[PDB]
Amino acid sequence: GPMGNGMNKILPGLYIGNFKDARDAEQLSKNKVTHILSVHDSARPMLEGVKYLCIPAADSPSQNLTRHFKESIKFIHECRLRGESCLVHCLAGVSRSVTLVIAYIMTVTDFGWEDALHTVRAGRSCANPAVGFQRQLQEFEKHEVHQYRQWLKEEY
């Protein structure tokens, strides 16, 4: 459906879900989620036992997510390098959270955005970034992802 069917594993230690999944104690415990990247309107830390990164991004054609790629990748990557599990979520788990995870996958592999989206969809079939985010991801692939891969090498 249009908000998925529960949070889904994308890679080891990396999950995508909707805002309800992100409050579901049964899902968080079963998937051992200890880090949540919340990317939606008025995102704030909610639960105990969880490290949050909150990005107040709207579902709007004007919303810039590229400027949040670096902070998001650092948060996800440092969680995963510690052997812990991160959930990235927005409202529906379809567009905003998916875009950040695509940028992560592109940075830790040699994938362009379309192969990164294929990877997300293998775990979360409803994934579908809005057209504005597709444009940002294509520009990222063309001009920036190579710089981000070098940054990842130098940092970690």
Side-chain angles (χ1 to χ4, degrees):
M3 310 183 76
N5 301 119
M7 73 180 67
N8 302 116
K9 186 179 81 128
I10 309 305
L11 286 172
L14 186 52
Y15 294 77
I16 298 174
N18 67 40
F19 78 91
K20 178 216 165 149
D21 306 323
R23 316 159 159 191
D24 191 330
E26 279 184 281
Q27 294 189 58
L28 294 167
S29 164
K30 197 230 305 150
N31 294 319
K32 305 192 151 123
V33 172
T34 59
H35 290 62
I36 293 178
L37 195 173
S38 300
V39 50
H40 60 73
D41 306 67
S42 305
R44 56 200 139 99
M46 321 267 306
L47 301 175
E48 294 172 47
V50 172
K51 290 180 181 177
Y52 283 86
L53 169 62
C54 293
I55 296 164
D59 172 23
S60 61
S62 38
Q63 176 68 52
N64 179 327
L65 279 185
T66 307
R67 69 162 54 98
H68 299 296
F69 286 179
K70 204 69 134 283
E71 197 188 16
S72 295
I73 289 161
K74 170 179 157 62
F75 182 80
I76 296 162
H77 203 58
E78 297 186 353
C79 173
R80 297 185 66 258
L81 290 179
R82 285 184 261 125
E84 295 185 59
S85 285
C86 183
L87 169 70
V88 189
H89 82 87
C90 48
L91 185 77
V94 166
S95 177
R96 283 167 288 184
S97 54
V98 167
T99 294
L100 299 180
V101 168
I102 288 168
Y104 181 76
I105 291 168
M106 290 173 67
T107 298
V108 302
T109 68
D110 67 358
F111 290 6
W113 76 269
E114 292 200 73
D115 283 336
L117 175 57
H118 178 87
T119 301
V120 177
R121 284 177 168 162
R124 184 161 178 87
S125 59
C126 70
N128 196 25
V131 61
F133 295 149
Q134 295 179 41
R135 295 188 303 253
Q136 295 174 46
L137 288 166
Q138 182 69 57
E139 184 72 10
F140 178 66
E141 180 178 333
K142 214 200 160 323
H143 296 103
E144 281 222 79
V145 68
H146 301 272
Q147 291 183 358
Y148 273 51
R149 295 173 180 144
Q150 182 57 31
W151 163 85
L152 192 91
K153 175 144 181 232
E154 292 175 0
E155 283 304 300
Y156 310 98

